[PDB]
Structure formats: structure tokens, C-alpha cells
Design a protein around this ligand. Structure first.
Ligand SMILES: *[C@@H]1O[C@H](CO)[C@@H](O[C@@H]2O[C@H](CO)[C@@H](O[C@H]3O[C@H](CO)[C@@H](O)[C@H](O)[C@@H]3O)[C@H](O)[C@H]2NC(C)=O)[C@H](O)[C@H]1NC(C)=O
Ligand SMILES: *[C@@H]1O[C@H](CO)[C@@H](O[C@@H]2O[C@H](CO)[C@@H](O[C@H]3O[C@H](CO)[C@@H](O)[C@H](O)[C@@H]3O)[C@H](O)[C@H]2NC(C)=O)[C@H](O)[C@H]1NC(C)=O
Ligand SMILES: *[C@@H]1O[C@H](CO)[C@@H](O[C@@H]2O[C@H](CO)[C@@H](O)[C@H](O)[C@H]2NC(C)=O)[C@H](O)[C@H]1NC(C)=O
Ligand code: NAG
Ligand code: NAG
Ligand code: NAG
Ligand code: NAG
Ligand code: FE
Lengths: 320, 651, 323
């Protein structure tokens, strides 16, 4: 009853690992989304070479929709060749950071669960349960491990499912909400009313410390699982954060993952990248829209391959 | 320092304490213990002050002793108040369920009966019975009063609101919280039964003797036991609901001045205790009644150090209070001796497919303690440990059978034989000629290895110093600084350890000791044949033959190992599976079920099967009158911290 | 038996490594900012050369200035290839960042769990010599303020930003946590009675009434390796993940390059660095060909005056062809 040491449910463990591999996938996600911008930029370079060929034919549509000033048209064309790469640098700077910050959160969650998964002993005592007198194994912990529980069996950033998790159409906010207290349910987090001898979840004497309660509050994850200074027996889980553990009794699983220490920076820096990504994309859009109204129909219907052959021809002509 | 900060819950208690300090200062030297007093609002603020290292000690009733042991306080019983003579101290009371002779209902049949309680929220009259019957109560069990009212067909629970719960006052209308109510308190609860108003009275063991002076009158009453049987009112020690400590001094589990409180209170009872000084009284004051300590107390006793609040309060009391506090309501955990036994137990856990579970401990008595409190459910024990375990409240359920039988399961055995093994070469050795020689014991507290040869030795030398009698030897469990740990083979820390980490532990281990270091080994009659003649593939045993070993007969005679029948020290009781009384049926069922399906790890390796017990479901009954008497004779020479603790509750 | 703890110096060196790994995100960003500087310089030079060609000021070729026709064709196509190689490089920059992040998160969780596992009566999991608990004053490579989830170092914190600025290489920092660099003196600490269960695998340690016999518990990715029955005495020997025994010493990594979490970091940071160096060499070689055939007049021309005079000339040469 008081000597009672509950274990974490495998389902709760898998959901943490789930988020963990999504976070490992943020690197590939930024790379994919960044790649779209460069495709949109490549189209701008191809369409501006279409304009320069129209400038050279002197067969620039006499669109009263401001194609009369040849000077400022070409000035912005050359300017673009430099203005864009320094704003694209800004978005990649934010991509690296979000990718890393996410990686930190992933590792924090991974260590936690992996240590709990290793704290298993033949029968009766363990930290991740499945209801039986047998601890949870790699088949139960499918989102955590790719086989026999160990350090090389955990998912790496270049691994199989990390890459496919990056194309899951799931947004950060949704995945984060998945591990909230509501989305998990009190019951599905901890295996209550069972003594599985897991000391990693006891702040009271004979838990983390053998003779005393802790001098302070304790947290697994970065505020995912929270404990009071003297938690013993049947784990009284309620929704809340590290700040919400007022009593010695208190066990609190996060209700708002954005309030969790480790997720804060991921949210922030992914938002930075997205903010920039989308501002660059609108810059390209407004520019493409202003150049297109000046490109001549003869050069417009011109295919990418022969567009570059013909450019060289008049280019070398005018130079000499 | 050597000062004890005492907690006082009132102004009158704080002033009696100033008087306590001042009078102590006047009789104890500078080097010795001293008192200092701290005032707090209630008992809970006192428990809190101790935990917060502001105060050091306070005396509490069992109910608060439970609250004090709970986190974050983690306090513990250090000193106990006793009542009556020094010879028979009355440290605990027994909560009983008194009924009338021939009423024909058991503990499990209490639903629909008429109950008499001392009062609502009282220990013996309410908290203990209603705590135990909690799960027998109808749903919803909250409010508790409503549920109790719907369980019994009419009650008397004084101090309860009859306006809300009228069934609780059916026998004493109004539930009067004064002695004006004829059925109030212990005496009244008994009167409620005596007058035939109720069918059961929840009282103390004493209540019948306090209300009926004639032995012939008391004979017409019986007690309800938890095993669903009845027993006479004079058999309360064998038939009770709970065993409750009267008044206990508490202190911190770690960093608590346990020894300093004992020293101060032992010195205090000697100088201002019962019939000692006219100047100051420890158990009396003009400023009020029961200040700091109960006025009825006769003095103090030290609580055995092995004793933890749970064990001290007892399983029954703890279970009653847990049920009430928690409200939690709807396989066998086998205890393993070190990692060797645990490894085997684990295989058994998975193979049995969630029928048997495991728990580890480094000693057998640590495992007995685990069974006792509830951490574990059952374990197979040697005869000597069945005695200790039994004296700790546990019961045997199955016996280990070793002889080849047709129906082994229902054919009981008289036991194995304890023998003294010598080499054929050491012809100078006689049973009497063992003084100043080298011995090899299985472990201290074991049947063949300790209890039988050391008991026969104590009945001759009439003293407990066995380390003086022998030059050296190996008896795992002995003090590491003794001569009886000098011949052990355990690696550093593992030397003289009572488990398989020590290479000279057990029957095979003691035989190995005789071959390699010693000159006499105390084992079972079948130890020499089981290891000799290549039967043991181990390097030390591989080349040994039983022709080279003899037996020491009690008449100073020597005979071969096969002639054990007429050259044995004593018959030894077979190893038995012990458990908590409140587990007998399930252990018996699963073990029999398991047995038909599936080094001496968990059980002796020469076990052919687990045999049923009948009338012999008690340690006295199983081990037999002869063995119990022989082990009892060695109580003066005991080393067991667990036995010392278990006998503090039931000597 | 003695009950010891992990010493503050071991915890601090592990923390240090973690803040270096968090710094890798900023390191790749700086290194990539160097490249885009060099690539912009290349795009500048090509306009300057184009202007010289139109103004006919390309010097009497001492080097191959006679075939600017081909040496401009190749440059306008090389400018395009470098942009695709840049993106391959940046792809690696985000993976290196993330992988390093992972490694840092794993270590951070480990040390932080030990740092919090601390109570009264000199009972703790992180020591300051033969005493403790270690507070935020000790463990300054780990924390900002009193031990908590909000006081650990974050990716944009000054400490991580300043650690990114150093000339220390991955291998150097990895070695700083090896058993060789640390030593038994710097790993085991505390009094013989600090009751730290995180460091005990024997019965009543990590598990109550049992031991983790199914798995050989490893903190980090194989930095601190336990077996099944460790005393809690903090007896340490050098070794890797598979090396831990039942009744043996704790195995502290001899070679941190052999550890699971550092495996991808070494690999992906190297992938970035290799790709970076390759692109930088290519930009250098092409710039070096261009800076030869420009001329001091057109060479001095930069930014707004460059475009201004380049457009001035393109409009002039176009009116020349029209007549
Ligand atoms: C039980 O706790 C013990 C301390 O409380 C711990 O003792 C350690 O035992 C080892 C034995 O290997 C000693 O190390 C010795 O081993 C090397 C081998 O290369 C020898 O050259 C040296 O003599 C060296 O001293 C340790 O010194 C000793 N630890 C201490 C602090 O005294 C046990 O290991 C613990 N048991 C388990 C299973 O963890
Ligand atoms: C940077 O990494 C990006 C992913 O993190 C990557 O974007 C993706 O590029 C691949 C090809 O490299 C595209 O996949 C297509 O081609 C493969 C060829 O085997 C097919 O199997 C697929 O079905 C698919 O047609 C992805 O579509 C693309 N992702 C997105 C969302 O655009 C970049 O290409 C990498 N950039 C560099 C320069 O290395
Ligand atoms: C890209 O990240 C870097 C920092 O890693 C930003 O700053 C450049 O790099 C160092 C940082 O110490 C400075 O000395 C340089 O002067 C910065 N600029 C350049 C062009 O190298 C960089 O500015 C971030 N990206 C953007 C577009 O702001
Ligand atoms: C999660 O928790 C326990 C684990 O033993 C169990 O009830 C189940 O696997 C999960 N919850 C439910 C109600 O399915
Ligand atoms: C968490 O524990 C600390 C240390 O005992 C305590 O002071 C604090 O009040 C608790 N947390 C909160 C935010 O209440
Ligand atoms: C850590 O180890 C070193 C060497 O043993 C020593 O400084 C001390 O014992 C510990 N504490 C600190 C402050 O490093
Ligand atoms: C380490 O783990 C593996 C698990 O199969 C096993 O070798 C053993 O249990 C452990 N210890 C040793 C000595 O390798
Ligand atoms: Fe025996």
C-alpha cells in the first residue's frame, strides 16, 4: 500500500517515443520544406532569364502595366540574385536551430523511457508494465525500439521510421497534444494498484534515495512526469506541470505540453523557421508576378532546355 | 548533543515538562542525557516538528503512531509504556469480537447481525472491526456510517448522529456520548451483548473480565477469530481481531535520537517512575490527567531495533487502518534467498505463467519479515526457521517429502536425521572429544547444522559461548569477528553470509568445509552419499568416496554413513512451506496445482514431492512437542533480532 | 558496504560535452555563413567581368583571358551547380545539428536525474568531494540557477552560443568524458553513506526487492554501464556497453567515439564538413580565374554602382545592336 511501487504503462511509454521519433524527424521536415522554397526560387531564375531574353529582342510586351522602365526591371533582377540568398540564409539558420532544439527534446524523452525500459528484472519487478508479471519487451515497445532492448536498437535520426514520420502530415501542435494528460488518460499512464518495485518513480525514502524523501521536486522528461518531494505508494496522477506539484504527495503529468521546459524552444524555433519560410515564399510570389507581365509570349512558350541555348547566343553577340 | 527536545500539545503539558527537565538536572551528571521542552498546537503538529528536526520525541496512541510512520514524517516506535508488573508487562491490548456461546455465526457471517460498539470513531469498538469488515460492507461505502447501518440489522454506535443514521442507534436510541447511555464504552458494549440487545460486541480482551467476576458466568461467551472459528474468552492471544500498542514514544527513522531517548527515559523511570520519588512523578501531575504520558503507566521498555512501525502495529491493525483510509476494494509471491534462488524463482515465475511471483532478500529472517508485513507471501523453510517464522505468526501449509512413495502427496514422514560427520582417518574423535576442535555448520538457527548439536552441547556445558568451546569453524550467520567465521570461504564481504554467496553455507557447503578445513560437519544423513562416489561433478567432490567417512554416535561410538538409523544425533522435522494465515487455501491450491505440472535452491534438491498437512497447521503441531521443547531450551543463546522482536509481541 | 555517488567533476564534463553538442547547430550556421559570403563574392566578380568584357578592358591575357567566351560560359553554369551543392550541404547541416541535439538531450536527462536525486542528512547522487548534495554553485556547466528543469542550458543561451565560438574539435570534447581523461578520482565521490539508489543495481537499488537482470542498464548511450548486481559503492573500471558483468565494476567508456549517440554525430558532422570544404575549394578556384581578367576600373566597382553601371552598359550595347 505505502511500500507500493507502480510502473508506467507501455502505451504511455510508446506515446512518449512516438513524439520522440517525430522530433527526430523535424530535421528531415525542415529540409523538405526548405527544398520547396528553392524550387520556387529556381522558377524565378528561369522566369527572369525569360525576361532578359525579352529585353534583348526589344520585343518586351508594351504592357502599360509598367514594362516601360527597362532600367529598374533589370536592376531588381540583379538585386534579387543577392537579396534572396541572404534571406534564405536566415531561414536555414532557423532550420538548423529548430532541428537541433527538437533533437534535444527527443533525447531527453528517449533517455527517460530507455532507462525505465532497462530497469526490468526477469519477473515481478520492472518500470514499464503490460499487466503481466513479465516486464514490457521490445514487441510491446514498438515505437521505442527496433528489436531487443539496448542502445543500438533505439531509433537514430537517419533511421527508417524517423524519415517516414517526417512525411506524416501531423503538425507539431497535434503531436505534442497527444502526450497531454487528457489525450492519454490517468489510467493509461500509470499501472495503479500494483507493486512492480520501480524505484525510479518514488521520491520518498527507499526510492531515488534509500533513507530519506528528496529535498526538492523531481521530473522525468522536462516536466512531462512530475513528483513531489515525498511520493510513496499508489501514484495519484493529476494533470498539471512542474509548477503544479504543491504537496509531497503530488504526481503530475503535463496538460499543456507548451508549458514543458524542453518543448518550449522546439515550438519557438520551428515557428521562427516557418515564419521566415513563409515570408520568403510571399517575396518570391510578388516578384514572379511583377516579372511575368513583362516577359514576351515568344519567350514564355520557350522550353527550359532551348531557353538556355538561345540566351547564350544573344549574350555572346552583345558582349562583342 | 545529549539533549532530548520533548513535544507538549498544551500549556499544562509544557509546564509538567519544565518540571521534568528541572528534576532530571537535579539527579543526572553533565555527561549524561538531558530534557528540553517544545510546545505545539496538536499531536499532528508534534509529528511534523520531529520530522522537521525541531523536536525529537512525543508519546502517541497507535492511531497516530500509524500517521507518524507515513511519509513525509517517516517516524518510528523507539520506547513503549508498560502496564502492570515487570514480570508480565502489558504493552499491547487485544481487540476482540465477543459473542455468546452457541449463537452459530462466524466473522464472514456478520452481515445482518446486531452489533454493539464502544463508540463511533473509537479504536477497538469501531476503527478496528469496521476497518477489517470494510469490503464486506455494501456499496456505496461512503459515508462509512450509512454503509455500516446497511450492513448490520441494528446497532449501537454511541457519538453517531441518529438523525442521519437511525439504524446505528437502534439498540441505544440517541447514540448518547456519555456514561448515562447504558450501552456506552467497553462496559456498555459488553452490557449490550449481555442483555441480548446485540449479537456481537467489539471490545478489548479485558472487557469480559472487567464485567464478569465469575469464571462460570464468562464460560457462556466465546470470541470470533479471523479464520471463521470460535474460541474461549481466555484464549484471546490465539483469537483476536488486532494486537494494538497502548502508548508509544516516536522518533525519526534516520537521524532520530533513539539511543538518547532510551537512556533519558530509562534514567527517568528509575528516578521519578512508579513508586520511586515523592518529589516528582513521571506518571502524575496536579495540572491535569495523562500529561506527556498515561498516568496508568508503570514505566518503559526498549522497542527491539529490528521492529518497524508496520510490524510493531501488526498486520491486522495496519490492514484495518489502510482499508478505512484508502477505501481500495475489489498469485503467490515467493521469497528468494539471494540471486541464486531468485534466478530459479524467475524461471518458475514465467513457466507457471503468472501463478508464482518473486521477491529477493539476503537472509532468511529478512524474507520471514517480508512474509509477515506482506511484501511476500510464502517460502520453503528448514525446521529451525519454521520455529522462528511460526513465533512470528506464520503457519506451515505443505511438507517436503524425501522418501520414494506410491502416493507421496498424502503419506507424511517422521523426518530426516541430524548426523555428526568425521573422516575415517581421524579415528581419535569421539562425540565427547569435540572440545577445542574445528566444526562445520550448515548455518546458525538450522536443524541439523545448529539447533540439534548446539542444543545437546548447551545441555552439557550449561553456557552460550560456543566460540570458546571450539578452536575455529564455519557457521554462516555468526558475527564476522567470531572464531566460528574463521574457517569460512566467502569472498570479502560474502564471508560468513547465510546464503549461497558463502561457499560453506548449506548441507553440501558444510560437507565441503569438513573435506577442506574442518574436522567435524553437522548435516543430514543423506549428505555424504549425495556428494561422494562421483555423484557431485564438482572438482573437490569428484574423487571422494563415502568409505572414508564415519558418524559420531551419542554413546561415544563410531559407525559408517549407511548405518545412520542407529547412529544419529536426533530426528529432524522435514522442511515445510510457511505462509500468512490469511493465504493458506490459495498457497495450498496453487502449489498442489503447480507441483503436478512441474545446491538446494528454493527447496531441498532431494524433494520428491510437496505433501498435504491435516491437523498440523501450526508450528507446535508440525515440528512436534519434542523439537519445540529443544529449540525453546536455546532461547537464552539466541542471536535473532527478528525472534527478539516477534516475542516482544507474543513471548 | 559503501554507498557512494557520481562526483560533480564527472557531471560537469558530461554537461560541458552536452553544451558543445547544442553548439553544433550554431557551428554549422557560422560555417555555412562563410560559404554564402564566398558565393556572393563570386556572383559579384562575374558581373564585374561581364562589364569588363563589354567595356573591352579585360587585360592582354597573361593567363587565359583570350577565351573569355568559354571561361564565362563555364562560370554561368558553375554558379548554378554550386547552388545545388550548397543545398546538399545545408541538408547535412540540419541533420548534423539534430543528431548532435539528440546526443546532448540524452546526456542532459541523465545528469539532471542524478542532480535532482538529493535530500537531507547528506544523502545524494552528485557529490562535491566526499560530501554533498552538489548544488547549482557546483555543477555550473549543467545549470544557470538552482537545480531545476528551467535552469538547464538552452540552445540559444549565451553559454551554448559562446561554446560554439571555440577552436575545440568534436574529438577533443568527446575525449574529455573518457575514463582515461576523467579517471576513478573524478568519477566516484561522496561519503560511504549517501544512500544513492540510482547507482545501485543490486536488490533495493534501481528496483525494490529485485535487480535489472534482463538488461545491463546504461546511462548515456553507453557512457556509464551497469550489470545486474552493483553495490552502489560506485566501483568504476574502464569499459564499453557489452563489458559490464554481474558482480563487477561499473564500466565507464574508454573511447567515447564507440558510444551509440556519438556515432551519428561524428558521421553527420563529418558529412557536412566534407561537403563544406569541397564547395569552398570550388568557389575559390572559379573566383581565382575571374579576378585575373577584370581590370582595376571594373574591379573597384561594387554593389549599387555595379548594377547601375552594368545596366547603363547593357541598355547602351542594346541600342547599338538596334542601329
Ligand atoms: C560492494 O561494495 C564494495 C565497497 O563498498 C566494493 O568493493 C570493491 O571491491 C573491488 C574488488 O575488485 C576493489 O577493487 C580492487 O580490484 C583491483 C582489480 O584490478 C585490485 O587491483 C585492487 O586491489 C582494487 O582495490 C575496490 O577497491 C572495492 N571498493 C572500495 C571502495 O573499497 C564491491 O565491488 C561491491 N560489490 C559489487 C558486486 O558491486
Ligand atoms: C534535402 O532533403 C530533402 C528531404 O529531407 C530532399 O527532398 C526530397 O527529395 C527527394 C529526392 O531527393 C524527393 O523524393 C522523390 O524521389 C525519390 C527518388 O528515389 C522517390 O522515391 C520519391 O517517391 C520522390 O518522387 C522528395 O519528394 C523531396 N521532398 C520534398 C517534400 O520535396 C531534398 O531533395 C534534399 N536536398 C538536397 C539538395 O540534397
Ligand atoms: C546565420 O547564423 C550566423 C551565426 O552562426 C549569423 O551570423 C553570421 O556569422 C557570424 C556569427 O558570429 C558573424 O560574425 C557573421 O558576420 C554573420 N554574417 C555573415 C554574413 O557571415 C547569420 O547572420 C545567420 N543568418 C542570417 C541571414 O542572419
Ligand atoms: C494502460 O495501463 C494499463 C497497463 O497495465 C492497462 O490498463 C492498459 O494496458 C492501458 N489502459 C487501458 C485502460 O487500456
Ligand atoms: C516543489 O518542491 C519544492 C522543494 O521542496 C517546493 O519548495 C515547491 O513548492 C514545489 N513546487 C511548487 C511550484 O510548489
Ligand atoms: C571530484 O573529484 C576530484 C578528484 O577526486 C575532487 O575535486 C573531488 O573529490 C570531487 N569534487 C570536485 C569539486 O571536483
Ligand atoms: C550483459 O547483458 C547480456 C544480455 O544478454 C548478457 O551477456 C549478461 O546478462 C550481461 N552481462 C555480461 C557478463 O555480459
Ligand atoms: Fe535442515
Amino acid at each position: 500500500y505505502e511500500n507500493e511501487r507502480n510502473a508506467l504503462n507501455a502505451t504511455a511509454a510508446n506515446k512518449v517515443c512516438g513524439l520522440s521519433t517525430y522530433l527526430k524527424g523535424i530535421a528531415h521536415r525542415v529540409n523538405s520544406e526548405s527544398a520547396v522554397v528553392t524550387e520556387k526560387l529556381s522558377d524565378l531564375k528561369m522566369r527572369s532569364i525569360q525576361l532578359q531574353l525579352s529585353v534583348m529582342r526589344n520585343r518586351v510586351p508594351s504592357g502599360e502595366q509598367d514594362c516601360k522602365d527597362i532600367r529598374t526591371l533589370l536592376k531588381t533582377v540583379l538585386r534579387n540574385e543577392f537579396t534572396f540568398q541572404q534571406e534564405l540564409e536566415e531561414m536555414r539558420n532557423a532550420s538548423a536551430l529548430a532541428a537541433a532544439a527538437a533533437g534535444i527534446a527527443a533525447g531527453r524523452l528517449e533517455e527517460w523511457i530507455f532507462v525505465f525500459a532497462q530497469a526490468a528484472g526477469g519477473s515481478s519487478q520492472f518500470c514499464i508494465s503490460v499487466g503481466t508479471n513479465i516486464p514490457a519487451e521490445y514487441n510491446n515497445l514498438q515505437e521505442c525500439f527496433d528489436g531487443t532492448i539496448g542502445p543500438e536498437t533505439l531509433y537514430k535520426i537517419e533511421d527508417s521510421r524517423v524519415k517516414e514520420s517526417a512525411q506524416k502530415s501531423l503538425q507539431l501542435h497535434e503531436v505534442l497534444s497527444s502526450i497531454s494528460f487528457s489525450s492519454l488518460g490517468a489510467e493509461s499512464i500509470v499501472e495503479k494498484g500494483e507493486n512492480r518495485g520501480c524505484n525510479l518513480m518514488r521520491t520518498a525514502d527507499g526510492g531515488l534515495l534509500k533513507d530519506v524523501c528528496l529535498n526538492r521536486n523531481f521530473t522525468w522528461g522536462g516536466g512531462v512526469l512530475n513528483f513531489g518531494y515525498c511520493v510513496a505508494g499508489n501514484l495519484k496522477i493529476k494533470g498539471g506541470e512542474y509548477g503544479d506539484v504543491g504537496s509531497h504527495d503530488a504526481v503530475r503529468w503535463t496538460e499543456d505540453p507548451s508549458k514543458v521546459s524542453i518543448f518550449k524552444d522546439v515550438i519557438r524555433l520551428f515557428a521562427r523557421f516557418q515564419e521566415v519560410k513563409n515570408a520568403v515564399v510571399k517575396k518570391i510570389k510578388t516578384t514572379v508576378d511583377e516579372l511575368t507581365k513583362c516577359i514576351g509570349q515568344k519567350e514564355a512558350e520557350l522550353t527550359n532546355d532551348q531557353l538556355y541555348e538561345e540566351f547564350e547566343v544573344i549574350q555572346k553577340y552583345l558582349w562583342f | 548533543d545529549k539533549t532530548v527536545r520533548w513535544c507538549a500539545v498544551s500549556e499544562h503539558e509544557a509546564t509538567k515538562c519544565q518540571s521534568f527537565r528541572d528534576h532530571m538536572k537535579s539527579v543526572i551528571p553533565s555527561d549524561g542525557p538531558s530534557v528540553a521542552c517544545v510546545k505545539k498546537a496538536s499531536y499532528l503538529d508534534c509529528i511534523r516538528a520531529i520530522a522537521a528536526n525541531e523536536a525529537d520525541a512525543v508519546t502517541l496512541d497507535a492511531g497516530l503512531v500509524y500517521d507518524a510512520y507515513l511519509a513525509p514524517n517517516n517516524l518510528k516506535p523507539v520506547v513503549a509504556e508498560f502496564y502492570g508488573s515487570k514480570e508480565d508487562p502489558q504493552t499491547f491490548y487485544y481487540a476482540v469480537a465477543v459473542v455468546k456461546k452457541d449463537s452459530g455465526f462466524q466473522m464472514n457471517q456478520l452481515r445482518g447481525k446486531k452489533s454493539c460498539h464502544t463508540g463511533l470513531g473509537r479504536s477497538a469498538g469501531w476503527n478496528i472491526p469496521i476497518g477489517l469488515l470494510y469490503c464486506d460492507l455494501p456499496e456505496p461505502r461512503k459515508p462509512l456510517e450509512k454503509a455500516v447501518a446497511n450492513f448490520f440489522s441494528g446497532s449501537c454506535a454511541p457519538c453517531a448522529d441518529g438523525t442521519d443514521f437511525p439504524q446505528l442507534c437502534q439498540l441505544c436510541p440517541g447514540c448518547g456520548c456519555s456514561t448515562l447511555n447504558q450501552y456506552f464504552g467497553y462496559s456498555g458494549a459488553f452490557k449490550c451483548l449481555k442483555d441480548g440487545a446485540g449479537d456481537v460486541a467489539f471490545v478489548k480482551h479485558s472487557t469480559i473480565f472487567e464485567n464478569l467476576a465469575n469464571k462460570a458466568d464468562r464460560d457462556q461467551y466465546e470470541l470470533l477469530c479471523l479464520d471463521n472459528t470460535r474460541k474461549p474468552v481466555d484464549e484471546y492471544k490465539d483469537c483476536h481481531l488486532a494486537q494494538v500498542p497502548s502508548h508509544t514514544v516516536v522518533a525519526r527513522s534516520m537521524g532520530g535520537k533513539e539511543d538518547l531517548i532510551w537512556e533519558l527515559l530509562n534514567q527517568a523511570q528509575e528516578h521519578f517512575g512508579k513508586d520511586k520519588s515523592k518529589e516528582f512523578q513521571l506518571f502524575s501531575s496536579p495540572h491535569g490527567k495523562d500529561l506527556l504520558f498515561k498516568d496508568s503507566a508503570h514505566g518503559f521498555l526498549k522497542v527491539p531495533p529490528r521492529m518497524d512501525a508496520k510490524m510493531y502495529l501488526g498486520y491486522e491493525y495496519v490492514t484495518a487502518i489502510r482499508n478505512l483510509r484508502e477505501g481500495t476494494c475489489p498469485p503467490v509471491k515467493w521469497c528468494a534467498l539471494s540471486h541464486h534462488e531468485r534466478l530459479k524463482c524467475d524461471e518458475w515465475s514465467v513457466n507457471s505463467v503468472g501463478k508464482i511471483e518473486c521477491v529477493s532478500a539476503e537472509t532468511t529472517e529478512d524474507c520471514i519479515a517480508k512474509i509477515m508485513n506482506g511484501e511476500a507471501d510464502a517460502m520453503s523453510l528448514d525446521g529451525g526457521f519454521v520455529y522462528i517464522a511460526g513465533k512470528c505468526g506464520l503457519v506451515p501449509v505443505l511438507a517436503e517429502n524425501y522418501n520414494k512413495s506410491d502416493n507421496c502427496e498424502d503419506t507424511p514422514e517422521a523426518g530426516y536425521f541430524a548426523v555428526a560427520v568425521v573422516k575415517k582417518s581421524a579415528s581419535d574423535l569421539t562425540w565427547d572429544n569435540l572440545k577445542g576442535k574445528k566444526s562445520c555448520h550448515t548455518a546458525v538457527g538450522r536443524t541439523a547444522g545448529w539447533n540439534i548439536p548446539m542444543g545437546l552441547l548447551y545441555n552439557k556445558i550449561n553456557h552460550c559461548r560456543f566460540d570458546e568451546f571450539f578452536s575455529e569453524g564455519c557457521a554462516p550467520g555468526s558475527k564476522k569477528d567470531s572464531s566460528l567465521c574463521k574457517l569460512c570461504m566467502g569472498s570479502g564481504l560474502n564471508l560468513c553470509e547465510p546464503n549461497n554467496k558463502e561457499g560453506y553455507y548449506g548441507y553440501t557447503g558444510a560437507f565441503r568445509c569438513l573435506v577442506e578445513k574442518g574436522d567435524v560437519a553437522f548435516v543430514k544423513h543423506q549428505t555424504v552419499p549425495q556428494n561422494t562416489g562421483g555423484k557431485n561433478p564438482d572438482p573437490w567432490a569428484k574423487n571422494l568416496n563415502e568409505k572414508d567417512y564415519e558418524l559420531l554416535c551419542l554413546d561415544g561410538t563410531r559407525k559408517p554413513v549407511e548405518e545412520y538409523a542407529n547412529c544419529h544425533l536426533a530426528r529432524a522435522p522435514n522442511h515445510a512451506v510457511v505462509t500468512r494465515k490469511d493465504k493458506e487455501a490459495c498457497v495450498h491450491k496453487i502449489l498442489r496445482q503447480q507441483q503436478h505440472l512441474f545446491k538446494d535452491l528454493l527447496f531441498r534438491d532431494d524433494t520428491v514431492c510437496l505433501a498435504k498437512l491435516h491437523d498440523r497447521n501450526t508450528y507446535e503441531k508440525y515440528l512436534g512437542e519434542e523439537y519445540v521443547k529443544a529449540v525453546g531450551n536455546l532461547r537464552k543463546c539466541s542471536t535473532s533480532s527478528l525472534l527478539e522482536a516477534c516475542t516482544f509481541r507474543r513471548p
